[PDB]
Design a protein around this nucleic acid. Structure first.
Ligand code: 3TT
Ligand code: CA
Ligand code: CA
Ligand code: CA
Ligand code: CA
Length: 341
DNA sequence: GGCTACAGGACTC
DNA sequence: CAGGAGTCCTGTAGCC
């Protein structure tokens, strides 16, 4: 199989640049203002200008400002980025029916039947990079390999504004050399408990007792890593269908007071229903982020669709449930709908 | 034993 | 100083 992965560069930031070219060349920081106090919130993402100085996704906005006080701080305008995204996804579909839109920012294309080899695949990569630049002036990075995991690693190595092919030999080389931390799906926690078994590379999973790998990191995860080490990994490119829709908001104040939280919970429901469009969920979950950043939740599945009214009442019951079974204070409250009809 | 629901865990962008 | 949205897996407990 031949997979061609497309990853838009500093997507949110670049879209802002396309809409306002004077930004070009400056450090741009796209932010999620929380509402609690001046500059409370976090960085959603930033361009390379800002990034090369340590301003990265997830850090607090005030910390970003300490590092880059004169950078441009823009509020997230997701709907805008989503519309530009949708248009680019449509361009990619001209290249293949077997397409997987993994996020607002990435897409996997199976071009096995469009191209004969990696040479023709690389060339198809330039063709795509060019198309997107012509139509939307967005630069992207193209990763190419025999499966989704290595096509993504390929792009991770070539961004930004790049294109890279990882043929069969480098796959073998990477299995040996590549820091297993850089493997998609392995975060700090997993990587810590991995690399602490001397497993620092994909190969190391082959020589360790299985019940043991699986003891530290779970079955699915160990099979995944091993199948990759054996160069026997295969996951087809697939149309993705959204399985949940939700909304979570940050309260001005942390609270444990039911009447004080309801307003937030209710607004989160309204926004959620809106996004459901015509989907009818059978399940609802009330999600709360506590005082200390711990996530708690209580849900319920119904044998029928959930009307907005039923969502309102059930959410309060679920919220009460949380309040009763957890003495902590809530800082963020929301809901998530799933199991659509 | 294994399938279901539910709640938490970990990860990705 | 700690936003937001969405996905997959696992441990536990009911049940067949
Ligand atoms: N922690 C994070 C990470 C990403 N984001 C959002 C979700 S999608 C948008 C992608 O922006 P981005 O900077 O282009 O992400 P990348 O790491 O792919 N940058 P790139 O090198 O272009 O692929 O960032 C976020 O809100 N919070
Ligand atoms: Ca990405
Ligand atoms: Ca990107
Ligand atoms: Ca063509
Ligand atoms: Ca990692």
């Amino acid at each position: 199989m031949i997979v061609l992965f497309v990853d838009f560069d500093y997507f949110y930031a670049q879209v802002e640049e396309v809409l306002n070219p004077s930004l070009k060349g400056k450090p741009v920081v796209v932010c999620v203002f929380s509402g609690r106090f001046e500059d409370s919130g976090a960085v959603a993402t930033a361009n390379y200008e800002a990034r090369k100085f340590g301003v990265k996704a997830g850090i607090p906005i005030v910390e970003a400002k300490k590092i880059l006080p004169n950078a441009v701080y823009l509020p997230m305008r997701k709907e805008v980025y989503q519309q530009v995204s949708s248009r680019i996804m449509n361009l990619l579909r001209e290249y293949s029916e077997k397409i997987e839109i993994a996020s607002i920012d990435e897409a996997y294309l199976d071009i096995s039947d469009k191209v004969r080899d990696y040479r023709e695949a690389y060339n198809l990569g330039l063709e795509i990079k060019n198309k997107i630049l012509e139509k939307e002036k967005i630069t992207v990075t193209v990763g190419i390999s025999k499966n989704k995991v290595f096509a993504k690693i390929a792009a991770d190595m070539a961004k930004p504004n790049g294109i890279k092919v990882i043929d069969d030999e480098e796959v073998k080389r990477l299995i040996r050399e590549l820091d297993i931390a850089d493997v998609p799906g392995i975060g700090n926690i997993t990587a810590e408990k991995l690399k602490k078994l001397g497993i620092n590379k994909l190969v190391d999973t082959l020589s360790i007792e299985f019940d043991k790998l699986k003891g530290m990191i779970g079955e699915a995860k160990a099979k995944y890593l091993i199948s990759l080490a054996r160069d026997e990994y295969n996951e087809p490119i697939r149309t993705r269908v959204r399985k949940s829709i939700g909304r979570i908001v940050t309260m001005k104040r942390n609270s444990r007071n039911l009447e004080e939280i309801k307003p937030y919970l209710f607004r989160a429901i309204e926004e959620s229903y809106y996004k459901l469009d015509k989907r009818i969920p059978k399940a609802i979950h009330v999600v709360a982020v506590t005082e200390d950043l711990d996530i708690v939740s209580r849900g319920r599945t119904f044998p029928h669709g959930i009307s907005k009214e039923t969502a309102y009442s059930e959410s309060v019951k679920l919220l009460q449930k949380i309040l009763e079974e957890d003495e902590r204070k809530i800082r963020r409250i929301g809901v998530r709908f799933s199991k659509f009809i």
